Amino acid sequence: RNQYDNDVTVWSPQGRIHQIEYAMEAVKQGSATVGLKSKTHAVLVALKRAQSELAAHQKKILHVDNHIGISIAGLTADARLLCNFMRQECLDSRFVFDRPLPVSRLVSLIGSKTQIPTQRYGRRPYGVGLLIAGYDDMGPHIFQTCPSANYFDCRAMSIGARSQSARTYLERHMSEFMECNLNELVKHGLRALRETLPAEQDLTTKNVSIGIVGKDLEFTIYDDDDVSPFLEGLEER
Amino acid sequence: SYDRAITVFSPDGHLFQVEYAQEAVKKGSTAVGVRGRDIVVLGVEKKSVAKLQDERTVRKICALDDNVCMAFAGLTADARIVINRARVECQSHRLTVEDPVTVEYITRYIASLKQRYTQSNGRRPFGISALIVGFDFDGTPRLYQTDPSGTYHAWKANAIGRGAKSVREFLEKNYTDEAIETDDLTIKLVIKALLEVVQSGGKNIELAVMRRDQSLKILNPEEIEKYVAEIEKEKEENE
Amino acid sequence: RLKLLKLERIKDYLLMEEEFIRNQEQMKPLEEKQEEERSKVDDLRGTPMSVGTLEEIIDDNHAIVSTSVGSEHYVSILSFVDKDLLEPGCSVLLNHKVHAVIGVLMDDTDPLVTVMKVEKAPQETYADIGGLDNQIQEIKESVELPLTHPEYYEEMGIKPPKGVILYGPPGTGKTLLAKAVANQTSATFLRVVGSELIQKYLGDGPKLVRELFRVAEEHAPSIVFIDEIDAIGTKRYDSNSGGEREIQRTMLELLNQLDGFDSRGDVKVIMATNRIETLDPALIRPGRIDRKIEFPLPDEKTKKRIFQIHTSRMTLADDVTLDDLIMAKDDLSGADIKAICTEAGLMALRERRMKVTNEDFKKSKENVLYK
Amino acid sequence: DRGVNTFSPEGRLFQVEYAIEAIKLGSTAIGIQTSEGVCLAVEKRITSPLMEPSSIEKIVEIDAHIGCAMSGLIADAKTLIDKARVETQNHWFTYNETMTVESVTQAVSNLALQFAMSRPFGVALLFGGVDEKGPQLFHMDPSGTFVQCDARAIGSASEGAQSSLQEVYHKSMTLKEAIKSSLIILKQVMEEKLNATNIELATVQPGQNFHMFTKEELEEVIKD
Amino acid sequence: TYSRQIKQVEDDIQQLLKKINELTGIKESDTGLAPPALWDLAADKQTLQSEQPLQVARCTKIIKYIINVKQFAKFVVDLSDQVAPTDIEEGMRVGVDRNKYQIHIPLPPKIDPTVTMMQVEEKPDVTYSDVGGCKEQIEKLREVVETPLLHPERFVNLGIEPPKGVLLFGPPGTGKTLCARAVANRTDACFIRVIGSELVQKYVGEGARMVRELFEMARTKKACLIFFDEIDAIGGARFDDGAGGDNEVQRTMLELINQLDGFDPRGNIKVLMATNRPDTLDPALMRPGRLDRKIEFSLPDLEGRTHIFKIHARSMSVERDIRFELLARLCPNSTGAEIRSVCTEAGMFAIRARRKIATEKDFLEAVNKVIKS
Ligand SMILES: Nc1ncnc2c1ncn2[C@@H]1O[C@H](COP(=O)(O)OP(=O)(O)OP(=O)(O)O)[C@@H](O)[C@H]1O
Numbered sequence A: 001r002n003q004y005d006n007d008v009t010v011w012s013p014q015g016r017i018h019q020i021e022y023a024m025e026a027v028k029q030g031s032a033t034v035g036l037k038s039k040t041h042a043v044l045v046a047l048k049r050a051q052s053e054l055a056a057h058q059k060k061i062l063h064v065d066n067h068i069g070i071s072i073a074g075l076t077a078d079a080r081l082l083c084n085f086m087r088q089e090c091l092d093s094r095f096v097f098d099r100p101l102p103v104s105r106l107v108s109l110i111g112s113k114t115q116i117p118t119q120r121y122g123r124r125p126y127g128v129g130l131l132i133a134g135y136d137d138m139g140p141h142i143f144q145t146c147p148s149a150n151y152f153d154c155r156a157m158s159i160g161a162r163s164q165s166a167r168t169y170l171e172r173h174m175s176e177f178m179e180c181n182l183n184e185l186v187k188h189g190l191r192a193l194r195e196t197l198p199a200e201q202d203l204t205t206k207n208v209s210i211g212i213v214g215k216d217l218e219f220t221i222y223d224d225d226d227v228s229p230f231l232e233g234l235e236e237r
Numbered sequence B: 001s002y003d004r005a006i007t008v009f010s011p012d013g014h015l016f017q018v019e020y021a022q023e024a025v026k027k028g029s030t031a032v033g034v035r036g037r038d039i040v041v042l043g044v045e046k047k048s049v050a051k052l053q054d055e056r057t058v059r060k061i062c063a064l065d066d067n068v069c070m071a072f073a074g075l076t077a078d079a080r081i082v083i084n085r086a087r088v089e090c091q092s093h094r095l096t097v098e099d100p101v102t103v104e105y106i107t108r109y110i111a112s113l114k115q116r117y118t119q120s121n122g123r124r125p126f127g128i129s130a131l132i133v134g135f136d137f138d139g140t141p142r143l144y145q146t147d148p149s150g151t152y153h154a155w156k157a158n159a160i161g162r163g164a165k166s167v168r169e170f171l172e173k174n175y176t177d178e179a180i181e182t183d184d185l186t187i188k189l190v191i192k193a194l195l196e197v198v199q200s201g202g203k204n205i206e207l208a209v210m211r212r213d214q215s216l217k218i219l220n221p222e223e224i225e226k227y228v229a230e231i232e233k234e235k236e237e238n239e
Numbered sequence C: 001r002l003k004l005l006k007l008e009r010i011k012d013y014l015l016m017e018e019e020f021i022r023n024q025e026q027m028k029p030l031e032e033k034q035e036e037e038r039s040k041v042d043d044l045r046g047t048p049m050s051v052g053t054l055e056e057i058i059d060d061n062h063a064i065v066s067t068s069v070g071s072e073h074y075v076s077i078l079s080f081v082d083k084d085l086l087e088p089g090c091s092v093l094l095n096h097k098v099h100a101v102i103g104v105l106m107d108d109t110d111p112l113v114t115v116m117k118v119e120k121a122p123q124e125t126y127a128d129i130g131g132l133d134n135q136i137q138e139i140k141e142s143v144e145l146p147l148t149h150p151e152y153y154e155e156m157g158i159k160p161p162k163g164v165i166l167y168g169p170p171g172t173g174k175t176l177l178a179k180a181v182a183n184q185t186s187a188t189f190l191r192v193v194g195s196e197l198i199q200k201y202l203g204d205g206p207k208l209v210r211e212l213f214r215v216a217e218e219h220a221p222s223i224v225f226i227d228e229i230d231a232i233g234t235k236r237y238d239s240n241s242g243g244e245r246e247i248q249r250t251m252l253e254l255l256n257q258l259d260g261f262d263s264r265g266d267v268k269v270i271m272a273t274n275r276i277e278t279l280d281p282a283l284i285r286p287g288r289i290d291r292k293i294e295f296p297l298p299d300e301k302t303k304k305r306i307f308q309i310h311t312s313r314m315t316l317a318d319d320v321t322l323d324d325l326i327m328a329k330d331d332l333s334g335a336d337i338k339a340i341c342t343e344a345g346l347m348a349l350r351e352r353r354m355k356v357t358n359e360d361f362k363k364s365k366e367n368v369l370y371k
Numbered sequence D: 001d002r003g004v005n006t007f008s009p010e011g012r013l014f015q016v017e018y019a020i021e022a023i024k025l026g027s028t029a030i031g032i033q034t035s036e037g038v039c040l041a042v043e044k045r046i047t048s049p050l051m052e053p054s055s056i057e058k059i060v061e062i063d064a065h066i067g068c069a070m071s072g073l074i075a076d077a078k079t080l081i082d083k084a085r086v087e088t089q090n091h092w093f094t095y096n097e098t099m100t101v102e103s104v105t106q107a108v109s110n111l112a113l114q115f116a117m118s119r120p121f122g123v124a125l126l127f128g129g130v131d132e133k134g135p136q137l138f139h140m141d142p143s144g145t146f147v148q149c150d151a152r153a154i155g156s157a158s159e160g161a162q163s164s165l166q167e168v169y170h171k172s173m174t175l176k177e178a179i180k181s182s183l184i185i186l187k188q189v190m191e192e193k194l195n196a197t198n199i200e201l202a203t204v205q206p207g208q209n210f211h212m213f214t215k216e217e218l219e220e221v222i223k224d
Numbered sequence E: 001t002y003s004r005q006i007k008q009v010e011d012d013i014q015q016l017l018k019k020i021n022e023l024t025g026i027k028e029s030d031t032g033l034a035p036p037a038l039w040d041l042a043a044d045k046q047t048l049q050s051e052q053p054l055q056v057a058r059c060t061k062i063i064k065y066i067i068n069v070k071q072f073a074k075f076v077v078d079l080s081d082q083v084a085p086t087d088i089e090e091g092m093r094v095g096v097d098r099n100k101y102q103i104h105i106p107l108p109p110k111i112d113p114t115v116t117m118m119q120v121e122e123k124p125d126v127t128y129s130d131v132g133g134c135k136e137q138i139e140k141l142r143e144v145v146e147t148p149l150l151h152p153e154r155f156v157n158l159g160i161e162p163p164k165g166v167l168l169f170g171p172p173g174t175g176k177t178l179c180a181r182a183v184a185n186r187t188d189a190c191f192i193r194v195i196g197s198e199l200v201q202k203y204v205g206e207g208a209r210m211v212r213e214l215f216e217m218a219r220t221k222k223a224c225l226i227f228f229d230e231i232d233a234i235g236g237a238r239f240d241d242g243a244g245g246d247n248e249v250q251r252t253m254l255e256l257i258n259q260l261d262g263f264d265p266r267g268n269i270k271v272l273m274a275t276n277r278p279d280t281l282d283p284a285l286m287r288p289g290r291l292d293r294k295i296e297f298s299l300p301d302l303e304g305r306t307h308i309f310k311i312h313a314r315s316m317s318v319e320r321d322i323r324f325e326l327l328a329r330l331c332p333n334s335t336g337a338e339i340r341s342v343c344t345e346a347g348m349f350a351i352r353a354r355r356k357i358a359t360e361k362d363f364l365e366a367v368n369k370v371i372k373s
């Protein structure tokens, strides 16, 4: 791979572009975040890491609009830029039309932007992967977005390091998914995080952030204490 | 225009460019400065000049105001440009507030200039090291120094140039309020430091001194001759 | 106690051998006749037309011997041989009929040693080295007293430094100090330069490097003086252009020789470099090279000393004062001082006056100054 | 990886990594938060003698309710702190209030994110502020990752100081315990003895505003 | 006192030796037989019954057999007092006698001097427990290199492939060569160090040969541990660009890889790959089918620094008491090689103080000096 691997503007003699592959690698290096959904609820259960015992866990669930929340995995800087951008878009959409911005439209716009600096020799991708839980007129939406802009509308998705265990659990329990209460929804997300985490490590009411959106409930963030009832009621092994 | 990045961080975490710039400053002439109770002195090597070479066009020392004086070490054009920038800045500060620019403020401005020119996305960092001496409007024999990297500090004396190392150890040694009590013995310490590099008694040591809020003054060569003569008298008495 | 052991047994040797052997010599016979018998029997063992080349040795009494016609023939050796001199590639002696290994003789080697070892004791000694006492003492610590007094290190525990770099501007008596070390030390110093190991083709450079290192180890426990290497390698670059890739291979071979997997004898490496910041960060690794020494430009007093030592074999004039030359506070290496002295002498010779003059030395100063 | 902003194959921009290396090379500073306030103690790098302690400035004031400590490039800290002060005063002008420490830290980090500027800043910052949620400490790194910490250590002795902080710190102390432990660690990690001139010490309390300790109280705590 | 007694007694010994030489008289001049007697008449007779030439047998055609022999004179011969017909082999070194040319003695295969002395049968003087700061790496290496050899039935019961191929990489100087030496010393198998420079020769044809003979030698031996060093020198990026003339090294690397794992089993050969810049290494070689258990050596931590310090302090004349953990603390980001050089500097400081004790003060001075330079 000598040469052909600097800036997105260079096409490899393989139909491949490798800066994007590196951005996706950074996405994996990011921390675990799982989004899933029911007929009327979308739950993002995310593992906030602990850099140091004296440093509080890095929050990774951001409420962008009343009906839209994001879980981030990757460069916190690019995540912050993108979160600012979606907040601006939601405000502009609400201004122009007194409406909640459609989740699909929002995700398409974000994908478009993150594509834009992939065809010019002056800029870089955004090594940040987002799981978006939104509630539009059509109901709950779970979207995954990567630096490549290849947004995916998923019944349940997982991103970040160790995301494969969450993927396994979600694939196994999809049949139940779309047919469970809100508490069961959160419990399934918690089970996914438990599978992802090392067996010795357990989800305390300090490592988990739960962003829930749905009917008659703007995207609400549960951290520290708000996570306590869910973890307390959750099953063990 | 150019819009091309420069000043790339190194694998070690340093800037090859800034280290090159500081060594390029080091290779130049040597100059010392000291502060007294009301006298701030600044001597410097003349660096040789042909009998046909006017000294007026060798201005390695510049009075940026009635309280700030910079001795240069590097490239003369860079000196000229940075000096003119700083002096336009000081007149602008005079516009802003009807008070003379403090050495601290001017040093801040110079450091900001250095940072801009080292991280302005395509530039040649000024290979210069500057030494300023002033008296605040209230009056304070303040002396400041600025590295080409932009880092500046408060200094009671300094010595920059090719001999900077040895002169720095020398001045760190055998320096005290006894030496810096007043104009007396202070020029003597300066000349002793510059003769640390020997044999140039009459060929170098162009000297200036500024009294508290009085003015800056270049020391005339008959006075320099008298000072060096009495200094060598003191020497021979010592030995 | 150890002294007691050695003294006791040594006296035992003197007594045993001297007394018994002298008794037999007093009864000298029964020795000369046997010696002559044996010598003539060896001669009887065929000594016609005979030569052999040793390709290899199987074991005691059996080895393969090849002739110019490729007569590879395997033969059982004759014990009469000297034995243990049978290094592969040695010139053996073979009976005309049975090709019996009976003798070996080379008495001739590649003159690489005679080429790379010239004037082992140059005219320059530490007396000729005017100044640099600190550097001189440090290099002696590094090089000589390990060899001249292999007792202190042995008794205390550590082995001496292996590689010593001497870094400084272009001309500060690096080769002079190398020469003085050679002359003062009894070991077979080796001069080497950085402009010859850059061979035309692949493998040539590393091959001659390895051969040079092996020569150094074999012929004498001595010093190897590697001059400028910055023209070689300069660290390990991205390794794109073939020439620089090969030169990097040459440095890596140098690095293996400096400290490799197997071992290293009592051969010390002395590097001389104009610039050091650009050298391979790995090559100078403290395990391999230690005691990097500044060799800076002489100060005023060192310049006085250098002029004096250069001119010791120079009948300066009464009017000639060697202070106008110390006056110049600029770049004046020991080589520069030598050039100044030589130019003053030559100009005096040209202007026909047997005695040099202050003006002649002045003009030598201006015409030796480059910048 | 080579290039200006090229993404390294193993992730990261590799200029963030270079900046981290520069921060590690930088001098050492410590910050501790307590319900009674936040204390900052930064070792200085006074060069050869003749240096007044008011020559190197490793502590700065953000409003009368936050202090900031630096590790890295002096002028980089100067520029970042200038931005932070300007943003804080702009927010105060627009709000009739003072930012939260989280908000000022994230604003400065947001500026740091832009790599105009061709290189990341070579300074890591520690803001000890007093806001609606009491005294808090926010550590910001050149990458822009800002997090509030109970006790942080940065610079050349970053790792060792952080380990000592982990050993000594508990959820319950006061500003006095914070300062005494910080000074103990600073002396233990100092380049040379604790001369009372090679350090800068500040505190911001739910009460007295941000304050630089004067020579008297410096020597007092030192002997303590 | 003692020194003068030495000088006297060694003078006595030198006198005794020269006296022996002059009195009796033993020398060689040109060729010699110093060892008395050496009569070899029967040796001559059996040499005549022998003193055979040798060549390379080609084929045994028929099932009385027809051996074919090639040298400066071709031949077709067979039969001998020798048995094990052609030792069930054709391309050997036959070793056949003259005089009807039917009597033989098998011989090993000819191999060029390069590989002959690269065999490096010497045992480096290093052993385990002298390694600090890379406990995990040495654990990995011990496992991979020993479990397949030491009580390996446990290693086969699990039905797991035996790893084969390890590449040591890290900063310049971390004890990689030291660990390689230790493994070489401890191991009991055909060990073969390799130097990269010796594989670069005058134009094409040399490296590929020597590599192939090396490999067949290893295959002939029961079980081999090969120890390539200078892999950075031998084998690089396959790209040509301007290397169209330098393709020789790439060719040799290609043959190396093919012998490592091509269209044939490579055999019970375990490869060690020494390097310090593990990025320019060619992808084909770095393929984990040939370098299974790449190991990374990092700078030692405090405990590793202390352990290396005491290891080097194994030497005598050292202080009665030293406080090694503080020594390590004072030297952070220091290689084990730098610990070794610090011990050396402490010894040199003791000498330059004319002190036969290496004090903690000496260690501190050495640390200060090395840090400052
Ligand atoms: N773990 C260790 N234990 C003991 N000594 C060590 C250790 N690591 C390094 N050393 C010391 O460092 C030197 C080892 O150098 P060696 O040649 O083995 O290193 P390397 O990792 O192969 O790299 P390089 O060839 O770049 O030096 C010796 O001084 C050895 O004493």
Ligand SMILES: Nc1ncnc2c1ncn2[C@@H]1O[C@H](COP(=O)(O)OP(=O)(O)O)[C@@H](O)[C@H]1O
Pocket: C128, C129, C130, C131, C132, C168, C169, C170, C171, C172, C173, C174, C175, C176, C177, C272, C306, C309, C310, C333, C334, C335, C338
């Ligand atoms: N003590 C000394 N230090 C440096 N140079 C000296 C000294 N004594 C004599 N010389 C002169 O220095 C010259 C040799 O310098 P050299 O070793 O060639 O420097 P380099 O190797 O850096 O070119 C000689 O001509 C010699 O006359």
Ligand SMILES: [Mg+2]
Pocket: C172, C173, C174, C175, C176
């Ligand atoms: Mg020389």
Ligand SMILES: [Mg+2]
Pocket: E173, E174, E175, E176, E177, E178
């Ligand atoms: Mg090694």
